Design a protein around this ligand. Structure first.
Ligand SMILES: [Cl-]
Ligand SMILES: [Zn+2]
Ligand SMILES: [Zn+2]
Length: 191
């Protein structure tokens, strides 16, 4: 039970990489396949069954590129790679897998989709106005913002959960300069 079926996707907007990013919040996505004969649906293979049931539980019914997605357990056992239009993607041993490290289930901010995002790996002389503008530019409005004591991390509250999902998809691993890539997670905290 490692393969999720995700339907009612936005056929025109969704990519494998956006599905990687979003489902990678809850597990390590091994492979994605958008279906050729039903491009609003896709198969997603997690590393294991706990990851699959977690992703299903938290993402089913959430709004992604404007549409309410449905996430169920697939009838498939694995997601087969092809011998094209890039509907398939292999993400084996991705450097972007959050749950590489032993015990990581507790240190990746595993929470339901939340209007407040948790930012980490921020480099110095990234200002607040800089992060507000970057997040606002994903099409949302930034309601609140708070640095933690070192400015390596921050909370940032978009107007809605929908807008936070969009931002997370867009800006996780964003290059903020120096050699710092931003990490965006959900949060149960509030500013
Ligand atoms: Cl299918
Ligand atoms: Zn099938
Ligand atoms: Zn640093």
């Amino acid at each position: 039970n490692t393969v999720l079926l995700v339907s009612n996707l936005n056929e025109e907007m969704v990519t494998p990489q956006s599905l990687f990013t979003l489902f990678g919040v809850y597990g390590d996505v091994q492979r994605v396949k958008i279906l050729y004969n039903k491009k609003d649906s896709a198969l997603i293979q997690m590393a294991d069954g706990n990851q699959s049931q977690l992703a299903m539980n938290h993402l089913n019914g959430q709004k992604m590129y404007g549409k309410i997605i449905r996430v169920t357990l697939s009838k498939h056992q694995t997601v087969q790679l092809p011998r094209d239009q890039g509907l398939t993607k292999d993400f084996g041993n991705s450097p972007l897998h959050r749950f590489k490290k032993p015990g990581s289930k507790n240190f990746q901010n595993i929470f339901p989709p939340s209007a407040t995002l948790h930012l980490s790996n921020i480099p110095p002389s990234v200002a607040e106005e800089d992060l507000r503008t970057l997040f606002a530019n994903t099409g949302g409005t930034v309601k609140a913002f708070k640095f933690f004591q070192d400015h390596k991390m921050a909370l940032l509250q978009m107007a809605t959960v929908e807008e936070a999902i969009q931002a997370l998809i867009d800006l996780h691993n964003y290059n903020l300069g120096e050699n710092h890539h931003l990490r965006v997670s959900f949060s149960k905290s509030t500013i």
